[PDB]
């Protein structure tokens, strides 16, 4: 279902709230364009989907179908993160 679609899989209001709260650490009284938040959301979803693909590869390597935090850690360590 979600592989063949092109939509955004996160609600926009919570993501916007989180983006503003994170940005509060770098400069107070900050404004945002709607396009900036939309671009941030697109990039974030792309990043998470790619990471989950790598995580699934790691899970298969260990003869499982369930993904665990150790798979995320191995994938991120090999990627240099």
């Amino acid at each position: 279902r979600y592989q063949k679609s092109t939509e955004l899989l996160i609600r926009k209001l919570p993501f916007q709230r989180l983006v503003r709260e994170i940005a509060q650490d770098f400069k107070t009284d900050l404004r945002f364009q709607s396009s900036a938040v939309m671009a941030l959301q697109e990039a974030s979803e792309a990043y998470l989907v790619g990471l989950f693909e790598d995580t699934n590869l790691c899970a298969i390597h260990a003869k499982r179908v369930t993904i665990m935090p150790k798979d995320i850690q191995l994938a991120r360590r090999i990627r240099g993160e």
């Binding site: 279902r1 979600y2 990043y47």
Partner: protein, 79 residues
């Protein structure tokens, strides 16, 4: 408490789009942490860019430049 707005269904959908069959119950907190780290990096760079231009508003091109700096180019928002 704004990272608890990234819910279990959303993480499940993002994992399904990656071809994942089953999920452990401890994956959601890890996902929230990694998303926070990624967003912090990109937003730091974008705010640097908007501070150089002597602006108070973050624009889409600051985000595009920041992403290109991290090596994560994005088409469809300018450039």
């Amino acid at each position: 408490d704004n990272i608890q707005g990234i819910t279990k269904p959303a993480i499940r959908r993002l994992a399904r789009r990656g071809g994942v069959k089953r999920i452990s119950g401890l994956i959601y907190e890890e996902t929230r942490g990694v998303l926070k780290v990624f967003l912090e990096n990109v937003i730091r760079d974008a705010v640097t860019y908007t501070e150089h231009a002597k602006r108070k508003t973050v624009t889409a091109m600051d985000v595009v430049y920041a992403l290109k700096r991290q090596g994560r180019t994005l088409y469809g928002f300018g450039g």
